[PDB]
């Protein structure tokens, strides 16, 4: 199947309490493999997956210096964007960055991306063609003109459709024993009366990987939609994920409801009935 490598950056200013908090995390698919925390003691990029530990001393020196330089860049941008949006020095603000690349099962490049945010809202993003930018407002347009004149897109593209793909292929090979796995969800249903006349039917999906999954309820073929409680997909803590969906049904009519499970690790979508 397809795979992705993604890096996530968060810088949160804290005026009067020192330098901004900086946290960087790298992922291959849904598996974290590196991290950096400005408040941690090591002040180094640290391994978080077994297959990345074999990288040599130069790798960890290079990743530590480059991730520190990204934090210093966010430090300047936090004050610059503070002036763009006419905000005071007293408040805490956040810059978030995500970029990465996707490859196919044969390793071919599929797409690259980079998106930046300010205070949890879109700021600037690279377009699909990896040649132009889309600013979210007139303030971010100032950054766009600055990045256009500096030809930042051409530099970033050479990473996103080149260097990013090169490292993702190597990581997928080095961690083939754990990154090429697909665990199908274990499915079951539970029944919880809420009164003498109604009961909750909860449809469970446990121990699946990757996190992408679909749970839907259905009543006599007619889809249920807004009468369903759907919780966010959650990590089990061991590398797998969990999710459930519930619906309140009248007592005695449980046979009219069906749960439908969709996951790439399943040959055919499952249909459960109490």
């Amino acid at each position: 199947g397809s795979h992705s490598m993604r890096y996530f950056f968060t810088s949160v200013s804290r005026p009067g309490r020192g330098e901004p908090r900086f946290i960087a995390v790298g992922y291959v698919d849904d598996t974290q493999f590196v991290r950096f925390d400005s408040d941690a003691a090591s002040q180094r990029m640290e391994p978080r997956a077994p297959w990345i530990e074999q990288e040599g001393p130069e790798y960890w020196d290079q990743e530590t210096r480059n991730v520190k330089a990204q934090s210093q860049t966010d430090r300047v941008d936090l004050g610059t964007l503070r002036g763009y949006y006419n905000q005071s020095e007293a408040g805490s603000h956040t810059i978030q960055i995500m970029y990465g690349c996707d490859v196919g099962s044969d390793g071919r490049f599929l797409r690259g991306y980079r998106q930046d945010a300010y205070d949890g809202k879109d700021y600037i993003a690279l377009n699909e063609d990896l040649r132009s930018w889309t600013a979210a407002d007139m303030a971010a347009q100032i950054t766009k003109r600055k990045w256009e004149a500096a030809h930042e897109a051409e530099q970033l593209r050479a990473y996103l459709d080149g260097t990013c793909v090169e490292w993702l292929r190597r990581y997928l090979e080095n961690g083939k024993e754990t990154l090429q796995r697909t665990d199908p969800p274990k499915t079951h249903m539970t029944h919880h009366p809420i009164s003498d006349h109604e009961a909750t039917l909860r449809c469970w999906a446990l121990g699946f990987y990757p996190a992408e999954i679909t749970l839907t309820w259905q009543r006599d073929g007619e889809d249920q939609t807004q009468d369903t409680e759907l919780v966010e997909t959650r990590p089990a803590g061991d590398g797998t994920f969990q999710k459930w969906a519930a619906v309140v049904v009248p007592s005695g009519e449980e046979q009219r409801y069906t749960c439908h499970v969709q996951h790439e690790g399943l040959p055919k979508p499952l249909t459960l009935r109490w």
Binding site: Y7, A24, G26, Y59, Q62, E63, N66, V67, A69, Q70, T73, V76, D77, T80, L81, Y99, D116, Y123, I124, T143, K146, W147, A150, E152, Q155, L156, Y159, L160, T163, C164, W167
Partner: peptide
């Protein structure tokens, strides 16, 4: 490995 290129905003 992540990208080692930056331009301030």
């Amino acid at each position: 490995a992540h990208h080692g290129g930056w331009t301030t905003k």
